[PDB]
Amino acid sequence: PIDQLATDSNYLEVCYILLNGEKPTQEQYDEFKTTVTRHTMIHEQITRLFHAFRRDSHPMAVMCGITGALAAFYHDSLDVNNPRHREIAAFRLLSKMPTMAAMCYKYSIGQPFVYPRNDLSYAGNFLNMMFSTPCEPYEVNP
Amino acid sequence: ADTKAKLTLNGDTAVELDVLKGTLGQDVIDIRTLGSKGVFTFDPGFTSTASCESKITFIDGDEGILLHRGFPIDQLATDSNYLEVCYILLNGEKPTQEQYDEFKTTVTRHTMIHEQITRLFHAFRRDSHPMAVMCGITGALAAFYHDSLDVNNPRHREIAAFRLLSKMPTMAAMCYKYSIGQPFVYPRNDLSYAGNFLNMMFSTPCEPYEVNPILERAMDRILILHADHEQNASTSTVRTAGSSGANPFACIAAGIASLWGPAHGGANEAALKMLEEISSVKHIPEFFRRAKDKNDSFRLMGFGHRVYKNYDPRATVMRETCHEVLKELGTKDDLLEVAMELENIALNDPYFIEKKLYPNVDFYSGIILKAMGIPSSMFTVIAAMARTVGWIAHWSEMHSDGMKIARPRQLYTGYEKRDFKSDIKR
Amino acid sequence: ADTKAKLTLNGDTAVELDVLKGTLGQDVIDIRTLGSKGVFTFDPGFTSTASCESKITFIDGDEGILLHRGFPIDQLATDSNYLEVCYILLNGEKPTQEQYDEFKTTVTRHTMIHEQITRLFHAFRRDSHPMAVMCGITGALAAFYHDSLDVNNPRHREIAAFRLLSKMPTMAAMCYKYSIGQPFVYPRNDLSYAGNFLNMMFSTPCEPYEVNPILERAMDRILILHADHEQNASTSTVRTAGSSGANPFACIAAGIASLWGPAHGGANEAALKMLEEISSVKHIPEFFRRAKDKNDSFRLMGFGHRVYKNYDPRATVMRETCHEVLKELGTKDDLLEVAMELENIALNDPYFIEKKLYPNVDFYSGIILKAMGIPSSMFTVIAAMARTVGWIAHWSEMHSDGMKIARPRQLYTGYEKRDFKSDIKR
């Protein structure tokens, strides 16, 4: 039931559950969480597509813009009929969305992009990528 | 207090002119009615015309007096820091710790400049004199900060004041980094205005930067001492651009330009021509260049000032400050004994002693900056940077009074109405 | 020959002042040496103070008279051309064939903007106002063309000027193309000033663009009617800034920011608030917006002007031209028939007869520009582009007048000296 999942679980485990059909053992969770963390940083050239969209752009128009241009950069994980390829894609898209969404916001407001922090939870990392700046430390309120 | 009531003008009919009094300085004759009464005075330069009523800065050159809201520049420089002087100048009073904290927090809240603006920097050629980049960047701000342009709206002037207040040190720091090829440094909240600026100018990503407490005070002082200087030329332009509607960002850009006009306006070799004759006649370790140079003297080298008669009041604490810095940067400040020699010259040479080419504030500032690795290309940027509060205040004041648009008269001396019949056929 | 002799000021004793006469208009009371007696005048706005002697343009506000070098505006606007008029403003007399042809040549050979400035443009937002971009690029011209900021050099000055006249249009049109998303167009040395501008405004790679003679002629008259307009706030801004030795460009950039100051300075909805209430109360096809809008009247919409009493002398030709163009573009300006109704309202509506809101030149310039297909925002841009030849005439006339530095006084009414004691710790 969505109720228990929301109260007793965190987003990352729900990702595992949804994708595999079962809840994760601490080991599977660690392994899943580490893989995700292993693919958070988006290629730097892609970050150059952001400076081509007008600043005024509704962030959601930039998200469709950036996501539809990924295939050009991540061209090796496109054999949809290949099982290993679907998996690499799953994690690529899984890991990088919070990164790109965070950039969409920063970009529209004129602040510098913030990189993914490994020592931060999926949710805390996102709060951190959306609101912190290089001018002062950001306190992720629990 | 003899005629602080009235007086009379007589052309063909006697006009009753009220005499207005100031709390310090000379009095004035309210002539805002002659115009209508078909009477105009003639004063190119406005040397005999009060352009406004002000409460910000009082000067008395003959006696070397300089007050910011009644406070002598000396105390302000020693007992205060740049940020408080900003508050004082802007509000007319010293701040209570609470008002200070609130003022200091707001400033801190607007230090980072929009990133797109940072993309205008890469369009200017690297070689650009930083001060040409500062007028370039400041005059392009209005395009980015388009919501704080209703100069007639009180909330708008305030947002601008802080925007321009907070971001100048940031932009000035970038102007320097850019010209030298190092990465830009962001504003640090845990750093004082002065220390943050030293940090934004000199640190790199390769090693931690140690803000020396000494230089940090010498910088602050440099900043307080260049805060404002009454209705000088650049400030007159500010109020003039502003009275004609012009947005705040554009006013400062205009002020900034009017400020360094005498820098390049002298000549491609004004005070530069002899900076090149320090190679063929360098047989004498001093009178070769910057001692035989000034054929056309310059207060821009730090000698003399058209305002103060015998001495620049601001230079007192600046000379003291200069001493500590040299006494700190130890074995890196030795060669700089030409400062010791130059002063001595400005003090004991008949010419100088005659035309009063006394060392002014910028003389000691320059040495401090020069002793700080800072390039002469940045000297103006700092002065203007610091002078920005002085401009914002004067701009804010002009509005409160009513932003009386600039519409001076002229004495037409050209042709009388003549007929036109094209002399060309092309 | 009345009081053309002298006059006297009496504080408690007499003082005799001259009364220099002009070739036209009012003569002025010379008060140049008063300052050297402590005696000062008080005149915020300078409306009873001749700030200079000029021989460029003459205006008798009440007689609706506009003279340029003596040549009636309507005579130039009808039988001359922009450059020939530019030559008259800068040279004081109508040119010979050789003088003109020479001038023209020089102007077409320097109409390009450094390839590096193209990049600056790109660093701006696409949604930026074409006027802001316009200020930004002009305030940044100093960081590039750094071979002519020496104001005291007639060579530099003459070059600096010629660059502005040649490049301003290229610049103005480029703000447009960037504002709409079309590629920039390079000038054509074969076309006229006006025809060349229209081409850069509307030329597209897709095919050759042919300018309409009536449209080409119309634009040239829009320019002529904007080339100069005496000592207004914007020219005074160019004059004051220049008095300090500020490079040519910085002074031109201030004139622009000053020229549209009344526009943005109004407010996010000054003459815009009611431009939004044309949706809920559009039951009446006219008095709904631009007929019920002005609660705080505006000469910026084309109604009235402080300078003239009954009419604008520039509106004569511009209106006649306005008829030929609507007539020409015919079935494209059928809808823009509200032009005669606003002209009708201004003329008859009591609210306009009461406030003397007569259609000035910007009323019909606006009509012609809308007809040609030029966005509203591009109006003060084109207006400023046209006025720059005038700004240069003044700024240059100023640099020949011994260049008196604008150093005004002030009625100081603030705190008398008082010691400073800070009660904070931060």
Swiss-Prot record, chain A:
Lineage: Bacteria, Pseudomonadati, Pseudomonadota, Gammaproteobacteria, Enterobacterales
Residues of the full protein shown: 73 to 214 of 427
Superkingdom, taxonomy of origin: Bacteria
Subunit structure: Homohexamer.
Note: Citrate synthase is found in nearly all cells capable of oxidative metabolism.
Protein name: Citrate synthase
Protein's gene: gltA
Family (UniProt): Belongs to the citrate synthase family.
